[PDB]
Amino acid sequence: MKSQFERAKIEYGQWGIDVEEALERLKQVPISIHCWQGDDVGGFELDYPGKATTPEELRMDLEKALSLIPGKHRVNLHAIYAETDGKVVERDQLEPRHFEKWVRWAKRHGLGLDFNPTLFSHEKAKDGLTLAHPDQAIRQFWIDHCIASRKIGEYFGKELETPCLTNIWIPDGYKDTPSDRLTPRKRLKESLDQIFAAEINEAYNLDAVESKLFGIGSESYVVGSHEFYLSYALKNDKLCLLDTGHYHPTETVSNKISAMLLFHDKLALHVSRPVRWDSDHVVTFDDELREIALEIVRNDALDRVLIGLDFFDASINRIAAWTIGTRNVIKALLFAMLIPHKQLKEWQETGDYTRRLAVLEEFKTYPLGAIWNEYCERMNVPIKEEWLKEIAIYEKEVLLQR
Amino acid sequence: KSQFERAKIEYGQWGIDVEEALERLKQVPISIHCWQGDDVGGFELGDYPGKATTPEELRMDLEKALSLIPGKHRVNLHAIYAETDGKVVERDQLEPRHFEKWVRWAKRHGLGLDFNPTLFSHEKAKDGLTLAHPDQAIRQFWIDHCIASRKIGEYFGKELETPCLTNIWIPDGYKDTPSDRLTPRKRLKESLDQIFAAEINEAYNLDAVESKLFGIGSESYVVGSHEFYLSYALKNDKLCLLDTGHYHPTETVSNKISAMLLFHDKLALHVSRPVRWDSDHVVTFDDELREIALEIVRNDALDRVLIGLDFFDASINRIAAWTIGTRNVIKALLFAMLIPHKQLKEWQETGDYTRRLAVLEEFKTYPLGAIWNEYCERMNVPIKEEWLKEIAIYEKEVLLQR
């Protein structure tokens, strides 16, 4: 087989694409994978079979997937994954102790940890408003929670010697047509001001705001819109986090990256396949994923774009969702590394649209597979479909016994 | 007129004061664009007949339309509308002297002027790049044209004692998939920086940037994107101009006003009807326009939102196009002012989504016509359809003879 790799490399090398430099480079990009795929977003507070229902089930499940995904990565956690020890602990009261085990496990595995406060599935979120709720006592609870979550993020970064991204997503909005779009937004601004009042060293923690266009039950209006967070983050030196499923029909995260890189040091990204609404299907190796990777790489933004997954498909093997999802994004970055950017750029500069079109096109049939397979061999994860066998045995022996 | 009086009582029962609304309405200026009158030809060195051919014709046509539009408004001029007395003047050499006849006309009619540099239909725009052209000599030339345009808007403001909005819209982009989305944008940023270097008093001039998603010739990519402009304008304390035809399918300006007023002092808005692309059909009294009006009125923003028209329809009478469109945005403002905000606000704060919905819906049949008709008589413009006569007469007696 390995001649295929040698032969593949001379094809890319005829363009001066150094595949050895690309693999060296790819090796180091971490992808933050999301814990909630493992237990259908259950968490530990107070239809496909085999989910995790237990911290020790979830960590094992994560290990299984990680061992099938080449490289070294991070795990992205939600506050409701706190380990309380059988004590009822309220969300405004969560503390570094409540994530001690996660941090120990991450250290053990060489992982980073990213965090999120949870502002859904909760008594105090029942009216569909949280940070932007009319009642001052509700807003304050959620504020205290977010502040607690930042503290927990600071804890992660200090402990793991890699900054944690603490991302705020709120569900706040209305099912139907609002009579006031201004007042809830105003309240959101005021809540976020208070959440970010205390400074945290950015070696330990970075904050992100995540917009959404609509959700089920928040259909006609959501408070934390794209224009809102884009202005807020820029005003207050915060990261925007972009979810490829959180935008308009035909709306493109690839088109935004480059523009944001001009005005923001760093940018955060959640990848998820939306199908007609924000369905959070599993990421696929598709045109827009390739296009994103091209922007990341082309723009020399590998350390500037913090790449994460977010999807929850309960219709298939969940270890498999993780392994497919993450291998696709890696494959896309690899493909983007294997593009002749200099010639493509020069062609664009000189108005040679004919060649720019032609080669972009011709590169879609370059031996990507052979480069992808060799990289899997060296990074000790199974090649091509062989990772399926590993999942089948773990389904039989572990998942199907639960 | 007793008809008016019964209507005033239906509204007054919610505590809406029609006389107060009418007096606020009378105050609001709408910026009417000159280029509808000559089909965007300008005066630089099949369809409906009798378009303006010369500035005197164009001014007559505008006077006519204005005579049918209730209130006191403004005219938005494009640089190609310079009067250069038979001389060729390059766009970078344009001075206030080339607009004194417009300013003398404006002053004599009590009109404000708004302005735009002209960055299209020119030898130096043939590649479909302008401020973002790879060639430094091209960029520099258009930079100079924009600077010179800011001085002209300054002239306007000094002269008319209302500040001029000088808006930048550029056609820059690529037909097909670009291989570099960042560098043209870095260039656009740099150009703009230069354009805005010289300070000018906000009493005389305000600058705005207009994002588009896409046009003919530029389908895949537009340098001056929404995200780009939003950040630019925020960092550099400049205005955003939103064009209701410049966005995604299902994407609304009405959902953005509230977010932007939370971070920008002032906003500009062009209204036009997009039919499936940025087609610039004549504005109609529709759902989104009403919803735009609602946002402006209920967010207290009648002095914060600079409202203008942008549309070029050649299939119908051009004076009618202005009178329909401006009459529609004024009609929509009136509509908004006659909505019981206080109660609807309070109901949302309360959770009474049933009354919010019911009542917004019942107001759809309130006697708007009777108020609108009274208004038009008070303001000395024909009522209902009767302005068609003046148009028919004008067409026979003037536009036939052209």
Side-chain angles (χ1 to χ4, degrees), chain A residues 76-277:
Chain A
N76 190 14
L77 294 174
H78 246 278
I80 57 157
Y81 290 87
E83 291 178 273
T84 263
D85 218 285
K87 300 179 189 189
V88 252
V89 166
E90 298 284 314
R91 284 188 197 170
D92 63 327
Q93 292 302 305
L94 263 344
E95 271 173 39
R97 291 146 31 194
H98 304 325
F99 296 86
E100 214 174 5
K101 292 165 190 249
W102 282 114
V103 157
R104 198 152 300 128
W105 169 82
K107 220 182 308 185
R108 179 161 48 259
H109 287 99
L111 301 174
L113 289 185
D114 292 304
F115 194 59
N116 303 76
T118 315
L119 288 101
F120 54 91
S121 312
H122 193 275
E123 237 308 302
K124 271 97 176 271
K126 197 54 213 79
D127 294 328
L129 298 155
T130 60
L131 297 182
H133 198 285
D135 190 326
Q136 190 170 114
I138 305 293
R139 311 194 307 265
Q140 186 62 64
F141 169 87
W142 298 119
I143 285 153
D144 291 342
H145 181 211
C146 290
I147 301 184
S149 299
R150 297 182 66 224
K151 283 310 170 168
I152 292 174
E154 175 188 35
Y155 174 61
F156 291 178
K158 148 78 153 65
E159 275 301 312
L160 295 174
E161 298 180 0
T162 176
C164 162
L165 192 50
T166 309
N167 171 65
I168 312 197
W169 178 64
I170 58 160
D172 299 30
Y174 298 97
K175 206 205 252 200
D176 214 323
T177 315
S179 48
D180 183 0
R181 295 190 174 89
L182 187 81
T183 315
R185 272 166 197 168
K186 187 137 86 71
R187 292 209 252 253
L188 183 42
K189 185 173 153 23
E190 273 139 30
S191 293
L192 297 164
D193 281 3
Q194 277 162 233
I195 300 180
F196 305 130
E199 308 313 318
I200 305 177
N201 182 344
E202 60 193 46
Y204 307 149
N205 189 251
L206 294 157
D207 299 286
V209 286
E210 180 187 2
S211 75
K212 203 169 150 164
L213 171 66
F214 83 102
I216 286 47
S218 44
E219 343 254 41
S220 312
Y221 172 85
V222 338
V223 180
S225 71
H226 183 51
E227 296 75 22
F228 180 91
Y229 288 134
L230 223 149
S231 284
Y232 188 99
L234 201 68
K235 194 72 263 156
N236 302 102
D237 189 30
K238 247 71 250 223
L239 285 74
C240 287
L241 188 160
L242 295 194
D243 185 323
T244 51
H246 272 221
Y247 293 94
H248 286 66
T250 92
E251 184 160 8
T252 259
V253 147
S254 55
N255 184 66
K256 304 189 193 317
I257 287 171
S258 68
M260 289 189 59
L261 303 169
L262 289 176
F263 298 100
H264 294 257
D265 290 302
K266 274 173 147 62
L267 199 253
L269 213 196
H270 285 183
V271 322
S272 58
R273 184 167 37 100
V275 203
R276 306 215 170 257
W277 64 288

Side-chain angles (χ1 to χ4, degrees), chain A residues 174 177-181 185 187 226-227 248 255-256 258 291 295 298 344 348-349 353 356, chain B residues 174 177-181 185 187 226-227 251 255-256 258 291 295 298 344 348-349 353 356:
Chain A
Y174 298 97
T177 315
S179 48
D180 183 0
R181 295 190 174 89
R185 272 166 197 168
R187 292 209 252 253
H226 183 51
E227 296 75 22
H248 286 66
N255 184 66
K256 304 189 193 317
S258 68
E291 205 56 37
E295 286 300 301
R298 246 176 214 175
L344 289 157
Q348 168 170 121
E349 286 289 303
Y353 305 150
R356 178 190 62 191
Chain B
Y174 296 105
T177 318
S179 51
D180 187 352
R181 293 185 168 85
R185 279 177 186 159
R187 288 206 252 262
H226 182 51
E227 293 80 16
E251 189 172 1
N255 176 72
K256 310 195 199 291
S258 68
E291 196 79 17
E295 282 303 314
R298 125 253 279 200
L344 290 155
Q348 177 162 288
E349 218 74 1
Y353 299 149
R356 182 184 62 192

Side-chain angles (χ1 to χ4, degrees), chain A residues 360-392:
Chain A
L360 276 180
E361 289 304 291
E362 298 292 334
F363 269 73
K364 296 155 162 204
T365 51
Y366 266 53
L368 179 60
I371 308 286
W372 174 242
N373 298 348
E374 170 65 22
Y375 175 81
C376 290
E377 180 218 275
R378 302 166 178 202
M379 295 286 307
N380 330 115
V381 295
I383 88 186
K384 307 206 301 139
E385 331 73 45
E386 323 275 350
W387 54 270
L388 259 351
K389 322 280 243 307
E390 282 295 339
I391 292 191

